[PDB]
Every structure is written in structure tokens, then in C-alpha cells.
Design a binder for these strands. Structure first.
Lengths: 63, 145, 101, 69, 63, 141, 143, 56, 206
RNA sequence: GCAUUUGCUGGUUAUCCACUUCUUAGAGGGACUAUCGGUUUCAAGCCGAUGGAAGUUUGAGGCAAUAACAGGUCUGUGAUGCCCUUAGACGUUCUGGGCCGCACGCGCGCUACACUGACGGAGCCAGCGAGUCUAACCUUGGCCGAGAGGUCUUGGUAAUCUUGUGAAACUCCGUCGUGCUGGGGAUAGAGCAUUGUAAUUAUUGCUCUUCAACGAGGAAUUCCUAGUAAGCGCAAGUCAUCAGCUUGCGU
């Protein structure tokens, strides 16, 4: 289980056709200088920690 | 701490009024497999026959069952009031009878045939196989079966 | 003197309160014990018709209200001054009944 | 299915198995033993008047018992 | 949804341009003044008129 | 002369009235002790005002609470509304006002609406549905 | 220091008082004590067929103690519940009146309640004296 | 008397509406405009609001 | 602890454990802690309560339900499937019975067992739907920390409800069995079987 | 009454005195997004925190444009044009019957498929309302009856009496024990009552007996964002009798 954490730096904005997916930018919390942009399912506020099963996709906005 | 260790006198399925009574359920609700007794008739006849209600049917030694079937076949002699009775001033006698196991389907058949041969409106509806009481038929009652 | 009671009933707040005010003003013009205006709870009489004639349309409902305000004042007075104060304060919309004892 | 009358082969099974039960209750008896449910609700009384299990809460819809020692 | 309308806004500007050295920066003593220098039908409206007057004065004494 | 404060507490239709006078320490609800307020799983709800500030403060006062209206859960929320207000208002009048803030700080920091009754009130029913928001099922063909 | 029935839990008092009434053995339970359903909303007779009547007599006496006066019409609304009428929704149904009237007459004959002005039945001189003695014993049960 | 105020105050309303529809139908040619009743002890009085009183 | 005597007896077991520490029913909010970061500030065990009955307004803002204590968020999720709606006084009894049973099977703090169950049974990588036109493909996304707590309570109470349905074991015991078997990753619980099934679907769709 | 020590719980229709916290209802006060902080062109505003009974336009309604529809209604109207009929009438009235008739398809719903449950005792908590003089309305209390109900009285034209509407879900203790079983109560038999001139094609209520499908419902599809959904009953409308409906109300 190579679980890596991260925490939201800036909430970009909603995406998806129904708008149920929030696009956020996260700082990796082990190395600060790495910032990847991914998208989440539930409700996210500013500065809360996430869990990344694999931190490689850097996904774009859905339609 | 009501633990009792009786082992031998227990009995499985047993016959009363030509009906197989399940032996390992409580006596009041065990009697209710007889067509003609219900949860409240059987309760009263157990009370009148002086049976401990907590007993299974595998208990109840044969004189107690004989007392119980004495109460069922002759209720008015053992102080059961006439408003428990299944037939009151019945149709021909004017007496009070509680109809029991095999007589229930026959006395019902007697009543249906009695009011069929007179060609009363209830009898014709029964013969046709329709809802005999004054209830709608346009939407419900499908699947005659 | 005699124990009297004056009961006021109306559907208009403004036309009733000034009548009770005139009653009490005449009550301490020549002084006597008040047992002043005890306002009973207001009664709302509701009629809920549908909206329409014939039942076409969305099933919309109205409710109409009539509000009954009631007030009673329990006075005691000499027999002479009873008639004049019961006759001066007569106003449309306000129903006044006076119980003798 | 489930036995409703004690038969003195279930009775000794009560005495030598419920001390091994760290959580013991009405549904515990009917699952690991094969007992009648209403017999279990009598058994948990009998296992209390002489201490083999002890009560920690007695609600009419739920009884919770542990081994005494 | 706190947008004042052109009844509250236009009245408050007309009430400042002729009563400037009588109005404070405080709401509680501005609404007491609006009962004297103006005729407003409802209590709910003069609280809205005096509140926007107090808001305008806070940005008059700033500039 | 018999220093006494009366107050009230409310929940949704319920109105408990407290009579806080100086005395020996009986805390009785509807003539019966506080230990008998019986939904019996909310029995601790009448107990927070007796335990947040400590049981010592009640040794010199007498409490007599009567409730009407509401339901079984709504009434239980109404005694505790009246007990809390009945002790902080006793302290405002007959003992030091510095002590009142210390108890008012305790109840407010644990605010289950012990001092301030909540403003949640029923919404009226409308036509075309069986509830305030709920509508009847429409059929479309 | 002196106790009333208001300091006793209701269920624990009614059970303790119902046992006392049966131990005395003088209540004149009716002969119909084992036939009746006790309401028209009920389905089955009371399960405790020997001592369900003593529990009503204990429950009614405490109720009259806590109130000013009640009659057999207030007891029927109190002891009645919802009725299952099958396919149609439930509704409140008052209890049986003959049972409550027989309870009240039994209590008057044992002399624990009495007929009252303004109607109904109030609790008597001996009623307060006797309810409070079992109320005293119920507190001191815990060894 | 011997009538509840709920039925009394409503009956005063329907009495007024019956009077008003009567005078609209009757005094149609005189420019009728309304009525008001003054329920007093000793001869309750009714006022007719019509333009040509010399015709009414 | 110097008990105080007064005209109302207020029994001895009440104030002995509650004047100094405001416990649970009898359970401690001390030494309980969320072992999984990204669930702190969403699992609330920091202000103790006496019973899990708090008539609190948590629905009027977006994130205010996080400040609701998680024990009340489990009693709230028990009043479900229709016949039990608005029956909170039954749900507190179930939870009061559950934490007693949980302590018996495992002698740790039953509050700690609940937090262990929540921290495990929340999904970590979920799947959303991308419509386009036609086949309506799926897309794997992340999941919020709040939704992890929201869904963990959902899966636990659904699993207890379905297990206890046509069964002689009560809802209190099956809730206890589900929480204990989820505190460890036993995969004998409904929620753990669901959680890794949702995660392996997203693994295919990433 | 109990304790006894000065206390606790009660009763006492006006015994008297005092007061208005709770209740009532007139006049008012109260919120203005207030204070602070952050954002934007520095505006209109928005966001967060504090205070506050109240911060979504404070919640919910009422009211509600211009233009229209061949929308519904001539079966609300002594609103109405034209057509028809007008004495064996299509007027009106009276006896009967029908509108309810069942191979079947659809829409709104009620009860369920049970153990978060059913049953039995025990606890005991609302709010909106309605109610009779030349007419029998809401009915307390006593007595009778298993019950439904009967009978003798009483209060009330009502903040006074019904009525604290002692509602139901709910809560506690017990019986059941995974079994279409003590879940469910359709269908049917016999009796006792009540409303009505009249109950058969069961008005309705009750008592005993009869014990059906239904094991969570396919494609589809409805309603709903906080004291809301959902559960739960109660009053009113219709009414002489009939509520599985609606309009509200609280839990």
C-alpha cells in the first residue's frame, strides 16, 4: 500500500457534466515543492488533507 | 430459573378432533390449527380446562386433553357465555353451537346451499362465484382462482 | 349601586378599542372601581372553499377569515348613570350587551 | 429445528459451555447452541440466580451478559 | 440578496444632501433622526433608509 | 423575605416554569423528584445544569418545575431550559454578579440551548401536498 | 423523613401495590375476570390472567391520588389505545367501561376512594393513608 | 338573543349582503351606491347611499 | 470525592463520575484519537456529551455537520427505512446497547472501536460517470475527507440493518459485530467488502 | 396524608390578600445585514467571525403586470343570446331501479411483507378547532352491558362546559422466537346493536369463527434541502348514517 497524502492548496472550480466533481490543487505534504492538480468527488474546503492511492494522473476537467 | 428436566412424557404431533396438532408449540396457539377455534376461543377453553398456559403441547397428559376437548365440544355447560359461540340461534334449532373441525366446512356448505335453493340474491352471487357483500368489482377481485 | 357587566364584540379593532376607552373614561370621570377591559382571545373563523366553479385546473384553495374580538368590562355603578353610559357609546360595527347581575 | 424442551444432554451442554462464552445473550444461545429462543430467555435467568454469568445491562428487548469469572 | 432598491437609495442621497451636518456615523441615532426629518410610512422602510444613510456616511468621511 | 425568582423555559410547544427560592435543596419536577423524569434515556438531559456547574450550588436553593404542552422529548428539553435560566437568574439577583458570569460561561460553552431557546418553529401546510414542502404525486398520463 | 407516592417510580409502585392488594385477598374481582378483552381495540385478553385485575386497581388508585377526581369516562380514554382495523388506518378507541366501573366500585367497597362532589371519584381519608404506606416500603426495598 | 357570537356576527354579514343585493336590484334607476346598518337598541337604522334622493 | 447531600437524594453513581469528567453513558472521551490523518477535523470526539441526543442545527451550513459528534451521527443513521424514521429514542438505546456489547467482545474503549471502524471503511478512490454520447464511460476520481466519513457511517449502518433484518440477532448485536469486524480489516463486514469493491473498480477506470 | 423538628405532597368555585414570570391582546420597541476582518475596477455587492430571540428577502403565505388560450364551466346563479320543447312535457312531483352493475387495461391512495417487530400490561405528552330556542348540537358524572351501545341526570350560545380534548407513534416490563409463525387480515358464515320512512345489492359499529395473496417489487417514474423529508395521530369540510379523501394542526 504505497499510500501518499496531500492537502488542498486552492480550489479551482467544479467540473463534470452534472458538476459533481471539484477540481483542486494539492501539495504533497512530504515534499512541499510538488503540486499536482487532481479532482475530487465529495465536498472539499480549503486546507484539508487528502489520500492518493496513486499520485500520477494529474487529471484534467471532465465533461 | 424455570429450568425443568422432563424427558420422557414429551410427545410429537398428536391428533385432536381429527387434526394433527403440532406438539412443540404453546398449547393455546397449538389448538388453533383446528378449523373452528381461534386465538381467543382456545385461550378461554384452556383457562376453563385449567391448564398451565406455559406448557408446550408435548406436555398435557391425556386426561387434560380429554378435558380440553370436552370444553370445545360442549362450551355452554362449562360457563362459556353465548357470545363466544360460532353459531347463535343458528338457522333451524335456535340452540347455540360452536362449530368445530370438520363441521365448519359442512355447516358453511349447508348455509350456502340453504340460501342457494331459495334463490335469494346472496345465493346466486355465491353460485356465480362473485363478491357476495356489497363491494365494488370493476377494479378489484381479479384472478378468480 | 349594583354589580353590572358590559360585554363588547366586534370585527373591527379600531372601532372597538376607542369604545372601550370611552367606557373607562366615563368610568373615572366620576370615579368607581374599574375591573377594566379583559381582552378574550381573538377568534378566527375560517372558510376554505376551493377556488372555482367546476373542477378544472390545478387544485388551488382559498381561505377566508373573519376575526371576532371580544372584550368585557365588569363595572359597578348607581342605577341612574348606567343608562346614559350604555346609550352614549353606540358605534356601528360594535355589539354591546349589558348583563344586569 | 430448534429444541424447546431440555433433554439432560442439552443441560450439561449449558453448564460446561457458557463459561467459555465471553459474550452471552439470547441470540448467542440460539446460534451456537440450537435452543428455542424462549428457552434461552429462561436460561439466562437460571444462569444468574446461581452465578455462572453476570449481568451488565438488563433491557426487556436486549440482555447483555458476560462470564462471571 | 441585500441589494437596496431605488426607493431606499434615492431617498437616502436626498436626505444627505440637505441634512449633512446633522447625521452621525451611528445607525441607532440616525434612525431616530429619520422620524423627524422625513415622513416614512413603515418602520421597516425607515430602518432600511437610515441604514443606507449610515453606510453612505462611512464612505463620505473616507472620501 | 424568602428570596425567590421565577422563570420559564421553552421547547416547541412546551413551557416549563421554574420557581427558584432559597432553601434546603429539593429539585422537584411536577411534584416528583428530578430523578424520575422518565423517558429514562434522556434522564441525563435534566442533569447537565446540575453537573456542568457542579452540584454544590444547589445546596441552598429550592427548585420546583411544572411543565405543560409539547411532547415527551420536547418537555425534557424544557426543564433543562428552565433549570439553567433559573440558576443564572437567581445569581443575578441575590448573590454576586461576578459568579453569574462564571455559570453563564459554563452553560454557554456547552450550549445545547440551555439558556437560549431555539427559533425553529413549524412551517404551515399548503394545499396540493400533505406537508409544508411535500407535494402529491403527479401522474402525467 | 416522610414520603408520598410522587417520590416513587410509577412502574415500581404499581407492581408493588398490585401485589399487596392480591395478598389481602379482599377486592371482589368479578366473575368475568378471565373472558374479557378489556377494550374493543385490543385483540387478545390480558396475558397475566390471574393478576391483571389487581394491576388496574393499583393503577387506578394512584391515578385518583395524583388527580382531583375522575370518573369512568376519563379512565376509558386513558386505558384505550389505537385499534388495528385491518386495511383501514389506525384510530384511537376508548377502553371497556364495565371493567373500570367494577374497579371503582371495588375501591369504594374496600374504602380507598369515595364518591365526590362535582362528580367523579376522589381519593379518601384511608386512601392517602394506605397509598403512602406501600409508597414508604417501596423506597426501602434495596437491602 | 340566545345565539352564539360566531353565528350572530356571521348572520349580521349575510343580512347586510341580502340588503345590498336588494337595493342594487330595486334602486337601479336611482344611482344606488351602498348601505350601512347601525344596529342600535331602539330602532336599528339603515342608510341608503343613492345620488337622486329626491327620487328615492 | 466529597459527595454533597441535599433534599433530593441524586443517587451516588450519578455525580461520582460526572461532576469532574463529563463522560458518555459511562464511557470516556479521553485517550480516544483519530489514527488516520485527513479524518481529523471531520471526526469529532473532542467535546464530550452525555447521551447521543443533541437537538442541534447542523444542516444550515455546508460543513457544520462535521462538528456534530460522530456518535450522534451513528444514531442519526439508524433511523432509516421508513418504519424507523424519527425514532431517535430507539436509536440511542441501540447505540447504548452496542457500546456495551463492543466492550465485552474486545476490552478496549468502545468509542475507540467506532473511530477505528470509520477510519477504515471510508472509500479512498471512487468512480464518477462521464456521459458523452452513448456508452457513458466511467472515470476514477479522488474522494473528499468529509465524504469518507459520510460514506463510512452509511456503509456500517446499512450493513447492520441488512444483517439483522430477518434474523434472531438484534440490531444492537449486528451493529456491534459490524463495528468490531471493521475496526480490523477482517473483510467479514459489509462495509469492508463494499469499500475495496468500490476501490478496485476505480483502479480499473483510472 | 406522611414525617414529625419549622418539612414535603395535596384538597378547598370565587375564604381573603398580593402580583402578572408563564397565558391572553391593545399600543409599541426590536434587525438595519449591526461591529470587525477579507475581497472587486474600489462602486453596487459578496464572504468569514463576533454579538443577538432573530442574519436565505429572518421563516411561511396573501396580493400580483402587458398580451393571450377558440383552456374549463350554459350541471352554481331569477348571468345570458340563439335553437329545441312546453300538457301523453324535456316542467314538476310520487313509487321502484340505476349512477356500485364485471373476461380486462390505467391514475390517486390504504394496509402490509414483521424482532428497529407483533401481542399483553404499565407509563403518560399536544396544537388547530366545532358545538343547541321555539331546537335537540358538543356532552361530563352516576347506573346497566363483553363490546357496540342504552339509560338517569348535568354543564355549555362558550378563554367559563365538553376539554388538560389523559391523541397516536413513543417509553418501561413481560410473552413470542426466523416457522407465510403469535407477520398480514383479504374473502366468508352466524349473532347483537346504532342512524334512518326504508339498510336486500352487506350504511356503519361490535362479538366469535374463516386465515387468501404478499419474503422488499422489472422497464419505468414521483416528491423533497431543515423543525424540511418521512413516521404518527387529531380537529374541521362533506354529514342523519357513512373518511381508506381533502383543508389545517401539532407530536
Amino acid at each position: 500500500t504505497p499510500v501518499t497524502l496531500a492537502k488542498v492548496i486552492k480550489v479551482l472550480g467544479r467540473t463534470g457534466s452534472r458538476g459533481g466533481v471539484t477540481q483542486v490543487r494539492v501539495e504533497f505534504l512530504e515534499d512541499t515543492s510538488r503540486t499536482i492538480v487532481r479532482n475530487v468527488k465529495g465536498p472539499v474546503r480549503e486546507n484539508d488533507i487528502l489520500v492518493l492511492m496513486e499520485s500520477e494522473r494529474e487529471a484534467r476537467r471532465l465533461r | 430459573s424455570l429450568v425443568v428436566q422432563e424427558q420422557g412424557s414429551f410427545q410429537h404431533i398428536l391428533r385432536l378432533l381429527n387434526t394433527n396438532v403440532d406438539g412443540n408449540i404453546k398449547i393455546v396457539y397449538a389448538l388453533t390449527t383446528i378449523k373452528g377455534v381461534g386465538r381467543r376461543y382456545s385461550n378461554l377453553v384452556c383457562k376453563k380446562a385449567d391448564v398451565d398456559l406455559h406448557k408446550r403441547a408435548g406436555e398435557l397428559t391425556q386426561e387434560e386433553l380429554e378435558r380440553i376437548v370436552q370444553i370445545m365440544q360442549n362450551p355452554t355447560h362449562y360457563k362459556i357465555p353465548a357470545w363466544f359461540l360460532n353459531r347463535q340461534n343458528d338457522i333451524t334449532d335456535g340452540k347455540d353451537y360452536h362449530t368445530l373441525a370438520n363441521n365448519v366446512e359442512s355447516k358453511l356448505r349447508d348455509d350456502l346451499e340453504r340460501l342457494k335453493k331459495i334463490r335469494a340474491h346472496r345465493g346466486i352471487r355465491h353460485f356465480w362465484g362473485l363478491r357476495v357483500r356489497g363491494q365494488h368489482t370493476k377494479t378489484t377481485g381479479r384472478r378468480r382462482a | 349601586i349594583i354589580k353590572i357587566r358590559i360585554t363588547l364584540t366586534s370585527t373591527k379593532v379600531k372601532q372597538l378599542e376607542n369604545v372601550s376607552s370611552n367606557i373607562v373614561k366615563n368610568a373615572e370621570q366620576h370615579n368607581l372601581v374599574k375591573k377594566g377591559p379583559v381582552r378574550l382571545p381573538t377568534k378566527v373563523l375560517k372558510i376554505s372553499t376551493r377556488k372555482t366553479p367546476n373542477g378544472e385546473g390545478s387544485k388551488t384553495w382559498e381561505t377566508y377569515e373573519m376575526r371576532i374580538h371580544k372584550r368585557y368590562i365588569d363595572l359597578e355603578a348607581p342605577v341612574q348613570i348606567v343608562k346614559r353610559i350604555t346609550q352614549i357609546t353606540i358605534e356601528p360595527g360594535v355589539d354591546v350587551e349589558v348583563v344586569v347581575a | 429445528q430448534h429444541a424447546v424442551i431440555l433433554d439432560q444432554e442439552k443441560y450439561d451442554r449449558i453448564l460446561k459451555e457458557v463459561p467459555t462464552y465471553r459474550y452471552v445473550s439470547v441470540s448467542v444461545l440460539v446460534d451456537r447452541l440450537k435452543i428455542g429462543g424462549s428457552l434461552a430467555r429462561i436460561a439466562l435467568r437460571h444462569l444468574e440466580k446461581e452465578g455462572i454469568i453476570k449481568p451488565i445491562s438488563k433491557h426487556s428487548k436486549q440482555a447483555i451478559y458476560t462470564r462471571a469469572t | 440578496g441585500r441589494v437596496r432598491t431605488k426607493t431606499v437609495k434615492r431617498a437616502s442621497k436626498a436626505l444627505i444632501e440637505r441634512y449633512y451636518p446633522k447625521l452621525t456615523l451611528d445607525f441607532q441615532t440616525n434612525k431616530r433622526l429619520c422620524d423627524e426629518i422625513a415622513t416614512i410610512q413603515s418602520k421597516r422602510l425607515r430602518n432600511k433608509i437610515a441604514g443606507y444613510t449610515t453606510h453612505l456616511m462611512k464612505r463620505i468621511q473616507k472620501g | 423575605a424568602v428570596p425567590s425568582v421565577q422563570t420559564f423555559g421553552k421547547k416547541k410547544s412546551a413551557t416549563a416554569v421554574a420557581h427558584v427560592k432559597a432553601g434546603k435543596g429539593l429539585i422537584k419536577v411536577n411534584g416528583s423528584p428530578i430523578t424520575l423524569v422518565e423517558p429514562e434515556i434522556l434522564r441525563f438531559k435534566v442533569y447537565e445544569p446540575l453537573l456542568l456547574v457542579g452540584l454544590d450550588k444547589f445546596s441552598n436553593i429550592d427548585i420546583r418545575v411544572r411543565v405543560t404542552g409539547g411532547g415527551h422529548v420536547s418537555q425534557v428539553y424544557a426543564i433543562r431550559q428552565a433549570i439553567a435560566k433559573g440558576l443564572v437568574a437567581y445569581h443575578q439577583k441575590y448573590v454576586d454578579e461576578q459568579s453569574k458570569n462564571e455559570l453563564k460561561k459554563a452553560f454557554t460553552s456547552y450550549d445545547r440551548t440551555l439558556l437560549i431557546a431555539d427559533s425553529r418553529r413549524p412551517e404551515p401546510k399548503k394545499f396540493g401536498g400533505k406537508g409544508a414542502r411535500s407535494r402529491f404525486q403527479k401522474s402525467y398520463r | 423523613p416522610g414520603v408520598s407516592v410522587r417520590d416513587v417510580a410509577a412502574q415500581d409502585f404499581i407492581n408493588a401495590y398490585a401485589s399487596f392488594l392480591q395478598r389481602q385477598g379482599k377486592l371482589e374481582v368479578p366473575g368475568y375476570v378471565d373472558i374479557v378483552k378489556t377494550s374493543s381495540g385490543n385483540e387478545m385478553p390480558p396475558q397475566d390472567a390471574e393478576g391483571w385485575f389487581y394491576k388496574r386497581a393499583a393503577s387506578v388508585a394512584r391515578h385518583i391520588y395524583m388527580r382531583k377526581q375522575v370518573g369512568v369516562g376519563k379512565l376509558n380514554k386513558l386505558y384505550g389505545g389505537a385499534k388495528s382495523r385491518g386495511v383501514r388506518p389506525y384510530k384511537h378507541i376508548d377502553a371497556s367501561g364495565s371493567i373500570n366501573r367494577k374497579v371503582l366500585q371495588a375501591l369504594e367497597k374496600i374504602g380507598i376512594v369515595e364518591i365526590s362532589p362535582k362528580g367523579g371519584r376522589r381519593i379518601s381519608e384511608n386512601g392517602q393513608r394506605d397509598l403512602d404506606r406501600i409508597a414508604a416500603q417501596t423506597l426501602e426495598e434495596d437491602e | 338573543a340566545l345565539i352564539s357570537k360566531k353565528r350572530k356576527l356571521v348572520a349580521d354579514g349575510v343580512f347586510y349582503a341580502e340588503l345590498n343585493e336588494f337595493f342594487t336590484r330595486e334602486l337601479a334607476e336611482e344611482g344606488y351606491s351602498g348601505v350601512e346598518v347601525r344596529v342600535t337598541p331602539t330602532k336599528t337604522e339603515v342608510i341608503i347611499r343613492a345620488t337622486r334622493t329626491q327620487d328615492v | 470525592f466529597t459527595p454533597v447531600v441535599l433534599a433530593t437524594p441524586i443517587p451516588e453513581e450519578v455525580q461520582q463520575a460526572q461532576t469532574e469528567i463529563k463522560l458518555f453513558n459511562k464511557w470516556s472521551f479521553e485517550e480516544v484519537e483519530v489514527k488516520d490523518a485527513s479524518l481529523v477535523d471531520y471526526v469529532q470526539v473532542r467535546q464530550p456529551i452525555f447521551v447521543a441526543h443533541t437537538a442541534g442545527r447542523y444542516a444550515n451550513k455546508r460543513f457544520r455537520k462535521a462538528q456534530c459528534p460522530i456518535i450522534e451521527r451513528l444514531t442519526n443513521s439508524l433511523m432509516m427505512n421508513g418504519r424507523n424514521n424519527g425514532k431517535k429514542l430507539k436509536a440511542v438505546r441501540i447505540i447504548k446497547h452496542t457500546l456495551d456489547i463492543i466492550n465485552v467482545l474486545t476490552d478496549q474503549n468502545p468509542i475507540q472501536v467506532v473511530v477505528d471502524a470509520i477510519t477504515n471503511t471510508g472509500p479512498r478512490e471512487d468512480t464518477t460517470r462521464v456521459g458523452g454520447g452513448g456508452a457513458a464511460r466511467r472515470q476514477a476520481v479522488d474522494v473528499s475527507p468529509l465524504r469518507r466519513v459520510n460514506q463510512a457511517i452509511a456503509l456500517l449502518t446499512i450493513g447492520a440493518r441488512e444483517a439483522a433484518f430477518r434474523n434472531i440477532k438484534t440490531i444492537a448485536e449486528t451493529l456491534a459485530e459490524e463495528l468490531i469486524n471493521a475496526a480490523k480489516g477482517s473483510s467479514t463486514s459489509y462495509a469492508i467488502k463494499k469499500k475495496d469493491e468500490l476501490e478496485r473498480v476505480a483502479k480499473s477506470n483510472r
